[model samples]
Target: DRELAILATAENLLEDRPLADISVDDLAKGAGISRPTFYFYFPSKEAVLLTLLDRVVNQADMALQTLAENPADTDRENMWRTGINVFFETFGSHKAVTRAGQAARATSVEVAELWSTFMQKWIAYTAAVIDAERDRGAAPRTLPAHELATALNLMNERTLFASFAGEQPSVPEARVLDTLVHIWVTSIYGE
Candidate 1:
């Protein structure tokens, strides 16, 4: 818990500066660990950030399960949209961590491994839900559910990163939320 919290704090500090600019000395102070002790937990800053990213992925999975179990009645998509909403809510609240995670994944070989593992798990979860909807006839048979789910999840994750990066000029930024819902709807209903 302490080590993870230390890593999390380092990620939170990313709201203030780039990961490349952050030194172990700075991380130690930010994490309340001495430089030597920080080394004990992580050989490098990338290690710490990668571990923190894993923590966020696991947290998001838990939140997704909760959303699936308790969706709002006002939604057209029930827990399906709610699950994506929870993902946005969580990732949005921690912009610093998300940014640092991006930086870590882009630069670190070790972090890429973590990203691959998490991505597979997330895609599998999305695919399984789509399959269930297919069995219930709520989803269209026109597009195979597995392929749709895989593509949609990949698109959503990229859209989220685009929104985080303020790069939604191709589509109105304000409509991205509705756009995501429409993506799900069209994929499911062939509309």
Candidate 2:
């Protein structure tokens, strides 16, 4: 009861202080509990952060799964757009989670590892969808599915980070996506 509330508060506080800076006492007091009582539920403050990170990962997975189930996005360009839109929508809704991820990644090895895992899974997930498009001949058949998938992964990640940093290129969304897709497709197939 109080433990979960305490963790939630700590996670919110992460918007202000780092995980390392937060202490058992801070969480206990914030939740209106005692240090010993907090310890009854969590061995350390890091545990709370870990729980919060798990929540973020689970949320991402659920959103991705929903995107996977949508049937109308089978075409190559449409699939790519859908995937990118899903990601943007997810991150936009969880700006705090994104910020927490960045901060934790900078300061904690565990968080960095978790981030790397998330990145790989994200790439693989997008790559698999692109592979399906290639199989359906919606995407260019000349380029290998894996290569195209990897390229899409890289492009999506780079563009997302740039957008997050408010460094978007001076182009319309359609134009940007088209140009980047062209570059990716041509790079792999020389078309």
TM-score of each: 0.85, 0.72
CA deviation > 4 Å runs, candidate 2: 73-78, 106-109, 142-144, 154-190
Global lDDT for candidate 2?
0.68
* Per-model CA lDDT versus the true structure: 0.75, 0.68
- Candidate 1 per-residue lDDT over residues 71-189, each given as its tens digit: 56764565556777777777777777787787677678877787778777777877777777778877666766667777888887888877876764434446666789877877776
List the lowest-lDDT window of 10 residues for candidate 2. Answer: 165-174
Clashes found in each candidate (C-alpha, N, C closer than 3 A): 0, 0
**Top TM-score prediction, candidate number:** 1
Leading candidate by lDDT: 1
Candidate 1, position 168, lDDT: 43
1-191, model 2: which lDDT tens digit per residue? Answer: 88678967786787676666778888998899999999998887876776777677667777778878865536445555565666666665555556556666767788788867877888777667656756776555665666666767777656755555455463443355565655655553343
- Summing lDDT over every window of 10 consecutive residues in candidate 1, give the lowest-scoring window: 168-177
